[PDB]
Ligand binder design. Structure first.
Ligand SMILES: *[C@@H]1O[C@H](CO)[C@@H](O[C@@H]2O[C@H](CO)[C@@H](O[C@@H]3O[C@H](CO[C@H]4O[C@H](CO[C@H]5O[C@H](CO)[C@@H](O)[C@H](O)[C@@H]5O[C@H]5O[C@H](CO)[C@@H](O)[C@H](O)[C@@H]5O)[C@@H](O)[C@H](O[C@H]5O[C@H](CO)[C@@H](O)[C@H](O)[C@@H]5O)[C@@H]4O)[C@@H](O)[C@H](O[C@H]4O[C@H](CO)[C@@H](O)[C@H](O)[C@@H]4O[C@H]4O[C@H](CO)[C@@H](O)[C@H](O)[C@@H]4O[C@H]4O[C@H](CO)[C@@H](O)[C@H](O)[C@@H]4O)[C@@H]3O)[C@H](O)[C@H]2NC(C)=O)[C@H](O)[C@H]1NC(C)=O
Ligand SMILES: *[C@@H]1O[C@H](CO)[C@@H](O[C@@H]2O[C@H](CO)[C@@H](O[C@@H]3O[C@H](CO[C@H]4O[C@H](CO)[C@@H](O)[C@H](O)[C@@H]4O)[C@@H](O)[C@H](O[C@H]4O[C@H](CO)[C@@H](O)[C@H](O)[C@@H]4O)[C@@H]3O)[C@H](O)[C@H]2NC(C)=O)[C@H](O)[C@H]1NC(C)=O
Ligand SMILES: *[C@@H]1O[C@H](CO)[C@@H](O[C@@H]2O[C@H](CO)[C@@H](O[C@@H]3O[C@H](CO)[C@@H](O)[C@H](O[C@H]4O[C@H](CO)[C@@H](O)[C@H](O)[C@@H]4O)[C@@H]3O)[C@H](O)[C@H]2NC(C)=O)[C@H](O)[C@H]1NC(C)=O
Ligand SMILES: *[C@@H]1O[C@H](CO)[C@@H](O[C@@H]2O[C@H](CO)[C@@H](O[C@@H]3O[C@H](CO[C@H]4O[C@H](CO)[C@@H](O)[C@H](O)[C@@H]4O)[C@@H](O)[C@H](O)[C@@H]3O)[C@H](O)[C@H]2NC(C)=O)[C@H](O)[C@H]1NC(C)=O
Ligand SMILES: *[C@@H]1O[C@H](CO)[C@@H](O[C@@H]2O[C@H](CO)[C@@H](O)[C@H](O)[C@H]2NC(C)=O)[C@H](O)[C@H]1NC(C)=O
Ligand SMILES: *[C@@H]1O[C@H](CO)[C@@H](O[C@@H]2O[C@H](CO)[C@@H](O)[C@H](O)[C@H]2NC(C)=O)[C@H](O)[C@H]1NC(C)=O
Ligand SMILES: *[C@@H]1O[C@H](CO)[C@@H](O[C@@H]2O[C@H](CO)[C@@H](O)[C@H](O)[C@H]2NC(C)=O)[C@H](O)[C@H]1NC(C)=O
Ligand SMILES: *[C@@H]1O[C@H](CO)[C@@H](O[C@@H]2O[C@H](CO)[C@@H](O)[C@H](O)[C@H]2NC(C)=O)[C@H](O)[C@H]1NC(C)=O
Ligand SMILES: *[C@@H]1O[C@H](CO)[C@@H](O[C@@H]2O[C@H](CO)[C@@H](O)[C@H](O)[C@H]2NC(C)=O)[C@H](O)[C@H]1NC(C)=O
Ligand SMILES: *[C@@H]1O[C@H](CO)[C@@H](O[C@@H]2O[C@H](CO)[C@@H](O)[C@H](O)[C@H]2NC(C)=O)[C@H](O)[C@H]1NC(C)=O
Ligand SMILES: *[C@@H]1O[C@H](CO)[C@@H](O)[C@H](O)[C@H]1NC(C)=O
Ligand SMILES: *[C@@H]1O[C@H](CO)[C@@H](O)[C@H](O)[C@H]1NC(C)=O
Ligand SMILES: *[C@@H]1O[C@H](CO)[C@@H](O)[C@H](O)[C@H]1NC(C)=O
Ligand SMILES: *[C@@H]1O[C@H](CO)[C@@H](O)[C@H](O)[C@H]1NC(C)=O
Lengths: 227, 211, 297, 37
């Protein structure tokens, strides 16, 4: 079918162009409508704008004078450029396929209809944070167990901004894994802690490594865990 | 956008009324949005659902004018806790740029589960980096609300502790971290460090000593 | 002086608010009501009712009905009425089959225009009349033999609002539109109107020639009441553009876009404000006659 | 109204003051049948 995946800077400075993109899969870019939706903490879903299968522009009056929704049909890619960003522009930005519905109530000849739009398939969401603060890489620290069932994990100290992706053995160890939400310390840096429950009998003939990725810093670090 | 509270019991029928009733013939959309996640199109036409939405999600069609749009969730699960929006289009009002307000359904009567506290001592590398950290990990508790206390030997700490607000898990239980940041010398100058996690009516303790 | 805005939505009926006398002569009320644009005009937004520079208007009593009732005309004692039972009798001449009646049949006084509605059909074949048919300035009364169905409706669900403008004086205003805003119109079967227009052109050749072409066109212009099929449907006066009916040179549904007026003068003078009818209006009629006009191929 | 008063009829109908020359005195009236009755 059709899926989507967004990707953006993750961090943009105030008063700057917030570039973004969204590559769709298993579907043609030029025969559907495409909607951008953002969602800030404390605020509800906000409809940015949308582009048509005819590549026609139509933005929310809320933003209006700052958005521009492009689309390049060479790939299955369509972009979004918000500029003059402020602190209130921090949100998760979603990429969804809008489909046009024509609600007829009276006579089509007299124009007694109206057009509505519904998004049926969405992207996963790209977090974007705006602040003058610079980027920052994390620094993983091991968390060793101490003996039937035991648990171990990784401590991802001091990074900015959200988020980080934690894999275990590059993706093999996927059962019993539990990555915890981050903590914004008063220093201005998030800290995350991942942990896996593991049969303690395997803790000798089985190696464990956590894979931490933080995109705004171009960092990919690993660390072993052992008593 | 503000939020409207709602509370149905587990297994009952939810009746989510639309916060913006229509003036003419309508075309109402219903989106299920779990916070910090992708919204889910439940019902797009006044009554039509997409492929992959249970029969228990029903929306009122407008055959005769006057019937307000409502979302009906029969046999409510614990996973049905989310935000629900009413995207109201009608022939009289203009273009529905804004979604609905926000109806946050909180399902009552779920099984109470006690947390699973696990405290880790400071790592060897970070102690070698002149900074210590106690990480008290709490998970799989309901209702999602715990209070965390830290004890140095037998004295309360309070100073230098950050605590996560209970986020939700895929199993509909809750989880929360709790980082105590210690100087590497303060960590060695004490006998034991305890983590008290008082969930609902009871407290659980997990202690760690430098050995 | 009316303070008018459009209705949210193509800008037909207006939403006007005005200061108005109350039941107490020293208290005013700021009240609002809807007026179709054919009832108001501007000043230079500020509007005024259309009649205020010509004559006052009398609101129709909301208890009298505009329904045509079969009326029978009778001759007094010492007089008589003679019927003409000639089933192919054009207006003038010597009727060979005559019968005397004390009274005529049931005549429905249907006020109509261009299209004679609900009237009496003709037997045998569809006749045509007129006086001097060679004189083009003489209207040709054509009378159908079979009825063509016409369906009209005002789809907007309207509300009536009483406005106490004096001791016992209550002007029934137009509240608001419940539900969808739509367009009032009329329907005729294009098939039945085709075969009926085919019947009319048949007898038109008997007076103009078996070879000449018979063209149909819309009105030549002038007043609103003559340019459009104007009639009454459930208490409100329609004005239907008949251009889609007379557009021919010699499942279906032809639709006529109708407007609606509330300030009608009729014949002359003095005018009447028809009070708004509540609910959804639709009426079913037979168009049984016609009033044509040749130009003078 | 809520001192301010109003005449009782003003919300129902206007009133016509009786002419101060016509009398309300009942006069003996005789009803008669027409010719043939
Ligand atoms: C005088 O002359 C006049 C001129 O001739 C004449 O005017 C006519 O007036 C009437 C009424 O005044 C008008 O009737 C209305 O018609 C509307 C349009 O209906 C047509 O289109 C729909 C939708 O078509 C899309 O979907 C179908 C499948 O669903 C596809 O097959 C189509 O291809 C199309 O999809 C493409 O096109 C879309 C664009 O529209 C694209 O977006 C899309 O991507 C695709 O590319 C069809 O469903 C209709 O089919 C029906 O009719 C056929 C006959 O052809 C029958 O076989 C059968 O009965 C079909 O049902 C038709 O083709 C209607 O929307 C409208 O009815 C709705 O509105 C009223 C008021 O708003 C509601 O009360 C009513 O209940 C209807 O609401 C239903 O539908 C809406 C919208 O989907 C829902 O939101 C709502 O929940 C409700 O659903 C409920 O009922 C459904 C059944 O109706 C059911 O399926 C649901 O599950 C639920 O229970 C109304 O009927 C007519 O259009 C005028 N004519 C013209 C030319 O405009 C006048 O009447 C004359 N007489 C007078 C004045 O007296
Ligand atoms: C023709 O034009 C007339 C005006 O001349 C229109 O009449 C007005 O219509 C509007 C709606 O479009 C009315 O406004 C509504 O008033 C309601 C009454 O509440 C008042 O009173 C409470 C006290 O109980 C106050 O607290 C409150 O603030 C109001 O002053 C309100 O309930 C409505 O509130 C809605 O809007 C607000 C703001 O957007 C929302 O936050 C609310 O949730 C709610 O949705 C609204 O304000 C106005 O009162 C009408 N005036 C008169 C004199 O009747 C006709 O509608 C118009 N008709 C057509 C066909 O066009
Ligand atoms: C045009 O608009 C008007 C309103 O401006 C609208 O009139 C409304 O009609 C409905 C009926 O469909 C009325 O609702 C009823 O109200 C009475 C009390 O007033 C109740 O007792 C009724 O209870 C039951 O009755 C229904 C049957 O009619 C049952 O099916 C149902 O189960 C109810 O429980 C019912 O609520 C409404 O009061 C009026 N509104 C006004 C202001 O008069 C009219 O229907 C519209 N017409 C069109 C063609 O759209
Ligand atoms: C041409 O002749 C037609 C037939 O006489 C006219 O149609 C009539 O139109 C009037 C007004 O538009 C209708 O009166 C309305 O009646 C309905 C309710 O009626 C229904 O319920 C009664 C029960 O008592 C039932 O007997 C009826 O058959 C209906 O089922 C309401 O909306 C109003 O009260 C209003 O008075 C007539 O009903 C209608 N008659 C028919 C046979 O359809 C038409 O108006 C004429 N056209 C012209 C231009 O003169
Ligand atoms: C009602 O709507 C009509 C059409 O949308 C408006 O007509 C316009 O009137 C202005 C006068 O100020 C003209 O300059 C425009 O050219 C008109 N537009 C059209 C398309 O005709 C009308 O002004 C509206 N009335 C009100 C009170 O808002
Ligand atoms: C009353 O006012 C109306 C305004 O609508 C006058 O009618 C218009 O008159 C102008 C000339 O002044 C014409 O150009 C328009 O075509 C007329 N329109 C309509 C709809 O009639 C009317 O003449 C005025 N009557 C009197 C007696 O002053
Ligand atoms: C109706 O029919 C009568 C005859 O049946 C027509 O009367 C004739 O009219 C012409 C003028 O057009 C006269 O020259 C004849 O002398 C008339 N004949 C008789 C017997 O009177 C009459 O014209 C027809 N009406 C129309 C409108 O055509
Ligand atoms: C419109 O159509 C026909 C005109 O012939 C009328 O319906 C017929 O009326 C005659 C006379 O009473 C009856 O003998 C028929 O049985 C009727 N036919 C049907 C199908 O009902 C109808 O009354 C006319 N309406 C008018 C003139 O207002
Ligand atoms: C005008 O309206 C009448 C009534 O709505 C229509 O008559 C209906 O025709 C259908 C289809 O043949 C029948 O199933 C109904 O039983 C009829 N109703 C009645 C009351 O007889 C008529 O067809 C319409 N005509 C036009 C030109 O619109
Ligand atoms: C006119 O006003 C009078 C006020 O006296 C109304 O009469 C009263 O109405 C109230 C209800 O609103 C009753 O409780 C009183 O018992 C009535 N009193 C009398 C003396 O009638 C009257 O209903 C109003 N009439 C109209 C048409 O509004
Ligand atoms: C009614 O009169 C007052 C007098 O000050 C005026 O301000 C107001 O605009 C008038 N209302 C209307 C609808 O014209
Ligand atoms: C009919 O009118 C024409 C002129 O249009 C005239 O010549 C002719 O005499 C008229 N016929 C009758 C019978 O009056
Ligand atoms: C008559 O038709 C002509 C052209 O079809 C059009 O310009 C004119 O507005 C019409 N007039 C009426 C009264 O329908
Ligand atoms: C009648 O309709 C025709 C087209 O259907 C249009 O050109 C004409 O202007 C209309 N007449 C009036 C008076 O609006």
């Amino acid at each position: 079918q059709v899926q989507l995946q967004e990707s953006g800077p993750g961090l943009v400075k105030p008063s700057e162009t917030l570039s973004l993109t969204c590559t769709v899969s298993g579907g043609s870019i030029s025969n559907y409508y495409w909607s951008w939706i953002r969602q800030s903490p404390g605020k509800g879903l906000e409809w940015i704008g949308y582009i048509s299968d005819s590549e026609s522009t139509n933005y929310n009056p809320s933003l209006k004078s700052r958005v521009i929704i492009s689309v390049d049909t060479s790939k299955n890619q369509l972009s979004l450029k918000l500029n003059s960003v402020t602190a209130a522009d921090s949100a998760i930005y979603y990429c969804a396929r809008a489909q046009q519905g024509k609600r007829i109530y009276g006579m089509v000849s007299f124009g007694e209809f109206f057009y509505y739009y519904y998004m049926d398939v969405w992207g996963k969401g790209t977090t974007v944070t705006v602040s003058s603060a610079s980027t920052k890489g994390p620094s993983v620290f091991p968390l060793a167990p101490s003996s039937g069932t035991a648990a171990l994990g990784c401590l991802v100290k001091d990074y900015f901004p959200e988020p980080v992706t934690v894999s275990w053995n590059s993706g093999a160890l996927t059962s019993g894994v539990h990555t915890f939400p981050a903590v914004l310390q008063s220093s201005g840096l998030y800290s995350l802690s991942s942990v896996v429950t593991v049969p303690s009998s395997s803790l000798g003939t089985q190696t464990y490594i956590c894979n931490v990725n933080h995109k705004p810093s171009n960092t990919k670090v690993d660390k072993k865990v052992e008593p | 956008s503000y939020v409207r509270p709602l509370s149905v019991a587990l297994g009952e029928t939810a009746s989510i009324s639309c916060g913006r009733q229509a003036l003419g013939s309508r075309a109402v959309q219903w989106y299920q949005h779990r916070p910090g996640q992708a919204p889910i199109l439940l019902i797009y036409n006044n009554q039509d659902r997409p492929s992959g939405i249970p029969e228990r999600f029903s929306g009122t069609p407008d055959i005769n004018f006057g019937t307000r749009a409502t979302l009906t969730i029969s046999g409510v699960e614990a996973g049905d806790e989310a935000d629900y929006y009413c995207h109201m289009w009608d022939s009289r009002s203009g273009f529905s740029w804004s979604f609905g307000g926000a109806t946050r359904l909180t399902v009552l009567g779920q099984p109470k589960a006690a947390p699973s506290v696990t405290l880790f001592p400071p790592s060897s590398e970070e102690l070698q980096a002149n900074k210590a950290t106690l990480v008290c990990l709490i998970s799989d508790f309901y209702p999602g609300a715990v209070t965390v206390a830290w004890k140095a030997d037998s004295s309360p700490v309070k100073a230098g502790v950050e605590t996560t607000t209970p986020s939700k898990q895929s199993n509909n239980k809750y989880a929360a971290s709790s980082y105590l940041s210690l100087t590497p010398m303060q960590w060695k100058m004490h006998k034991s460090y305890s983590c008290q996690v008082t969930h609902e009516g009871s407290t659980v303790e997990k202690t760690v000593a430098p050995t | 002086t009316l303070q008018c805005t459009n209705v949210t939505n193509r800008g037909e009926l207006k939403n006007c608010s005005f200061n108005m006398t109350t039941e107490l002569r020293d208290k005013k009320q700021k009240v609002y009501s809807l007026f179709y644009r054919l009832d108001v005009v501007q000043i230079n937004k500020e509007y005024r009712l259309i009649n205020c520079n010509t004559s006052a208007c009398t609101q129709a009593c909301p208890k009298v009905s505009f329904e045509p009732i079969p009326i029978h005309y009778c001759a007094p004692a010492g007089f008589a009425i003679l019927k003409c039972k000639d089933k192919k009798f054009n207006g003038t001449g010597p009727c060979p089959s005559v019968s005397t009646v004390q009274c005529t049949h049931g005549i429905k006084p249907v006020v109509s225009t261009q299209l004679l509605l609900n009237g009496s059909l003709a037997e045998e074949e569809v006749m045509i009349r007129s006086e001097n048919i060679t004189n083009n300035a003489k209207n040709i009364l054509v009378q159908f033999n079979t009825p063509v169905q016409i369906n009209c409706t005002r789809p907007n669900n309207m509300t009536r609002k009483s406005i106490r403008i004096g001791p016992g004086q209550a002007f029934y205003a137009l509240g608001d539109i419940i539900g969808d805003i739509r367009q009032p119109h009329c329907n005729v079967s294009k098939a039945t109107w085709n075969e009926t227009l085919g019947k009319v052109v048949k007898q038109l050749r008997k007076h103009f020639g078996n070879n000449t072409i018979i063209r149909f066109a819309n009105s030549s212009g002038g007043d609103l009441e003559v340019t459009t099929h104007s009639f009454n449907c459930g208490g409100e006066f329609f004005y239907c553009n008949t251009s889609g009916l007379f557009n021919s040179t010699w499942n279906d549904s032809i639709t006529l876009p109708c407007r609606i007026k509330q300030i009608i003068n009729m014949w002359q003078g003095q005018c009447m404000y028809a009070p708004p009818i509540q609910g959804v209006i639709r009426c079913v009629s037979n168009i049984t006659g016609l009033i044509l006009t040749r130009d003078g191929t």
